[PDB]
Design a protein around this ligand. Structure first.
Ligand SMILES: Cc1cc2nc3c(=O)[nH]c(=O)nc-3n(C[C@H](O)[C@H](O)[C@H](O)COP(=O)(O)OP(=O)(O)OC[C@H]3O[C@@H](n4cnc5c(N)ncnc54)[C@H](O)[C@@H]3O)c2cc1C
Ligand SMILES: Cc1cc2nc3c(=O)[nH]c(=O)nc-3n(C[C@H](O)[C@H](O)[C@H](O)COP(=O)(O)OP(=O)(O)OC[C@H]3O[C@@H](n4cnc5c(N)ncnc54)[C@H](O)[C@@H]3O)c2cc1C
Ligand SMILES: NC(=O)C1=CN([C@@H]2O[C@H](COP(=O)(O)OP(=O)(O)OC[C@H]3O[C@@H](n4cnc5c(N)ncnc54)[C@H](O)[C@@H]3O)[C@@H](O)[C@H]2O)C=CC1
Ligand SMILES: NC(=O)C1=CN([C@@H]2O[C@H](COP(=O)(O)OP(=O)(O)OC[C@H]3O[C@@H](n4cnc5c(N)ncnc54)[C@H](O)[C@@H]3O)[C@@H](O)[C@H]2O)C=CC1
Lengths: 449, 450
């Protein structure tokens, strides 16, 4: 029978394994994972630190026992040391007693994920510099937070943004550093991030944008962070400056993007037809540009894991690509986006324009309403939608998924301007705010004629 | 200059006129409207009666003066008496002095909308039987609600459902009657309406489903509504049993559906190439069946009005059809749908199956969460999505628009099962609840193959 080795098991491995066992229940699935847990939802770290998670065990949705019971041979506390695609073997280390074994496989599933970027900076080994990725890291932050009044968050991507918000609302003195000039520059245009930065300033967070850490130095009173433009004193520094694919086991053995992301076909197969990849080990197929990209999100892991299982024996279900839809909640605002920002489209040489629209999401005659700030990015010539974003105190998150479906189907601003959407004054004006947004894009293109 | 006559101006006429004047500023636009107002949002009636509207002037978004300022010749309080397409004339009555005039047109915009269905029943002329459509009706209801403790709502469609809830939450004794066995049968399947009906009962509303009124009889202490199965004593009856297209001016003169809805091409042109129709006077192109239908919603009026304006001279923008997406809020529940119910699909002989899924919309580890009851209706062979619905105390209304776009693009359950949707625990589980819904449809189709 078919022998399947799965390297790594947080989310992609978990979904791949369950899918493989459901659709090929004779297969012999072995999974290796360095940790002693699986399925930890790292989104819960900031939620716990912000006082929003009562029981942290609720942040796990599966377990080794569950996978074992389903028919998998589950090897926790094991570190895969080598993969030999020519001989189709893996060499593994039991972390409890150091014992090494070598095993054969017919199909290998590379769900080894990512690891935080850790720059080579003097002092980075300090006990006061911590990572924020897995359950081990979360437990350390849960313990440190009590004694750490002053917290420096290094990196203002999604992780840093959520941490800075969580610590600031729980009475800590927060400084937020990013190398770029704005917070979350990858995800929103300046009209959005200007508003978010002002929120941070209003809540007492110190912004240190356009700065890179040169050194960490311990002192009698805490940790000294020297940037190229300033020096900060802190009790705890959290490093969250992005992800690096954890794929060295296959470096030089399968096609990879420059950063090591495994390239796959539409069935999640690597350049080696017996080696699949899913999750943060793999590039995504990014529909707005029709290019490979590396934008690691749990949504990719659960989908690609399922596809590995469906395609393990022969191509069966095509990968649909992604829009990299994403969002978060900060200080009572919902902020969501999908596809390209205008900044990114222009940076990549694409033909792109944008409208920004601020409207109340439902009529003023209602008992209450809320402004929603909206962005639509489009090709001014083909009118193809390239991306969009929404921000409101009203929960507009579901509208980013509507835009995702629009992009998935290559819809234009003219489609979105008139496509049927319901009207009821509890929810919107006679035209939905997404119709209104696209109508403003029409008006921009028409004025350009 | 091109001469344009617009018959009727609540919403579709308003949007057509603004679009015409913007795209052809020189055209001479004359609009006739029976009432003395335009742009009244009838959705505000239930809201006002429910105590949710402070200033009812906020329920108007435009005005005769605004259209006049924009260049229209606005003839309020005028009633169009005749339309002769062969001669391209309209005959009109000034209601203030009965003066009639006849005018020529190059293009006519039929935005005459609809009127409530009023059946031929003994006693229906009573002062205690009221309509619930326009601003005149609203003002009458606002006055009478003060004294009438017992309200009978005749018709459990959207209007009736919202009225019953509005009156029930402001201290009235409400009885809700429908000829059909369920409330809102056109819009949701029984798993949803069973829940809504229980909601009405829990709030003291008396349901009289599967009953038709035989007579209204004034009695010593109120009005007696006689049905084929019971009798009810009320202080006010509201008749809201559907809309009829108000199209008699053109009956015999342009192709119509059996109920009088004007059939249009993809440019909103009637069978007479100089007469356009938009709004409740017109049929919609219903995408799930690819057939004409009559499902009057304000969403159609605003869209078709715009399209009339863009297509008045030459075909410029095609009509995309509709899924008839619709929904409402009742007792803290958001309830939305798009496309076909299972019941409707099978009543029309379509090949169709359904999955019902109830899940919390976001993870249980959050400080709160809410169940969402979901339905997906689909062709089990092609996998095409035919319709869907969601119900939750969390505001899931936007998800009905996601489904609408899925149907607009002829997407399948397999598309929806995997299409990219964001994950953040403030909003959903790793898979969005719409992904989860379609994955359950996938599981149902898989079980039926072996
Ligand atoms: C704080 C934080 C918050 C986040 N919030 C969100 C959010 O809100 N929404 C969203 O969509 N995404 C979010 N993400 C991203 C999401 O968590 C990741 O995309 C997801 O963890 C990737 O899943 P994965 O299974 O592919 O890889 P991983 O989670 O990285 O796990 C891969 C596993 O492989 C193991 N492994 C690696 N090498 C070996 C080896 N040689 N031998 C044995 N085992 C090995 C590792 O121990 C690891 O456990 C967040 C991430 C973080 C850190
Ligand atoms: C209580 C109520 C609540 C509603 N709630 C919603 C909701 O929440 N969401 C939604 O999408 N839809 C809702 N609707 C439906 C929506 O209001 C209608 O679809 C909309 O009014 C149709 O607009 P219209 O301009 O095409 O037609 P109409 O509003 O019917 O206006 C047509 C106009 O033409 C005039 N007219 C007719 N004949 C003549 C003539 N010979 N001469 C001169 N004038 C004439 C009439 O006076 C009328 O003003 C609701 C309707 C009602 C009654
Ligand atoms: N709500 C959501 O969707 C969430 C998803 N994630 C995703 O997990 C992955 C990792 O998250 P992040 O660590 O925040 O990565 P990120 O890619 O989202 O942000 C990294 C930030 O670090 C900055 N940066 C890079 N190098 C730096 C340096 N030397 N010094 C200072 N700043 C530097 C970058 O300008 C960038 O803003 C991302 O793909 C993220 O989208 C994580 C948390 C929440
Ligand atoms: N939130 C929303 O979308 C709303 C939109 N509307 C729309 O306005 C239009 C008219 O609204 P409604 O009057 O509610 O029509 P409707 O078509 O929604 O419902 C009419 C109801 O009356 C029943 N009925 C028909 N004849 C009857 C009879 N002789 N006796 C008793 N019951 C009878 C029907 O079974 C039906 O349930 C509809 O198209 C509606 O969708 C109106 C209010 C709110």
């Amino acid at each position: 029978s078919m022998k399947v080795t799965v390297v790594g098991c947080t989310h992609a491995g978990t979904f791949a394994i369950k899918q493989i066992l459901a659709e090929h229940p004779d297969a012999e699935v072995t999974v290796y994972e360095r940790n002693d847990v699986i399925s930890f939802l790292s989104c819960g770290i900031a939620l716990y630190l912000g006082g929003k998670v009562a029981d942290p065990q609720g942040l796990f949705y599966s377990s080794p026992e569950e996978l074992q019971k389903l028919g998998a041979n589950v090897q926790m506390n094991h570190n895969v040391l080598a993969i030999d695609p020519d001989q189709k073997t893996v060499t593994v280390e039991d972390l409890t007693n150091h014992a090494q074994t070598t095993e054969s496989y017919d199909k290998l599933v590379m769900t080894s994920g990512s690891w935080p970027i850790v720059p080579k900076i003097p002092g980075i080994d300090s006990d006061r510099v911590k990572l924020c990725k897995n359950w081990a890291h979360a437990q350390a932050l849960i313990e440190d937070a009590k004694e750490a009044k002053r917290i420096t968050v290094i990196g203002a991507g999604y992780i840093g943004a959520e941490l800075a918000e969580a610590y600031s609302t729980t009475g800590h003195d927060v400084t937020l550093i990013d190398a770029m000039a704005r917070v979350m520059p990858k995800y929103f245009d300046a009209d959005f991030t200007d508003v978010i930065e002002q929120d941070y300033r209003d809540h007492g967070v110190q912004l240190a944008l356009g700065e890179t850490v040169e050194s960490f130095t311990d002192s009698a009173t805490g940790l000294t962070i020297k940037t190229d433009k300033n020096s900060y004193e802190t009790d705890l520094a959290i490093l969250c400056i992005g992800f690096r694919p954890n794929t060295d086991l296959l470096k030089g053995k399968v096609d990879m993007a420059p950063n090591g992301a495994i390239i796959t076909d539409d069935y999640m197969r690597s350049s080696n037809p017996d080696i699949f990849a899913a999750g943060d080990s793999a590039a995504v197929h990014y529909n707005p540009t029709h290019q490979n990209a590396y934008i690691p999100l749990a949504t990719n892991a659960v989908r690609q894991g399922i596809l590995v299982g469906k395609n393990l024996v022969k191509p069966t279900v095509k990968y649909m690509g992604t829009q990299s839809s994403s969002g978060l909640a900060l200080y009572d605002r919902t902020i969501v986006s999908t596809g390209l920002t205008l900044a990114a489209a222009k940076q990549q040489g694409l033909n792109a324009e944008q409208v920004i629209v601020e409207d109340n999401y439902r009529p003023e005659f209602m008992p209450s309403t809320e402004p929603v700030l909206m962005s639509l990015v489009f090709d001014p010539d083909t009118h193809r939608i390239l991306g969009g974003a929404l921000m409101s105190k009203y929960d507009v998150s579901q509208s980013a998924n509507t835009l995702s479906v629009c992009i998935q189907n290559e819809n234009t601003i003219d489609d979105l301007a008139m496509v049927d959407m319901l009207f009821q004054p509890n929810f919107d004006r006679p035209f939905n705010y997404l119709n209104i947004l696209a109508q403003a894009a029409q008006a921009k293109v028409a004025q350009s004629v």
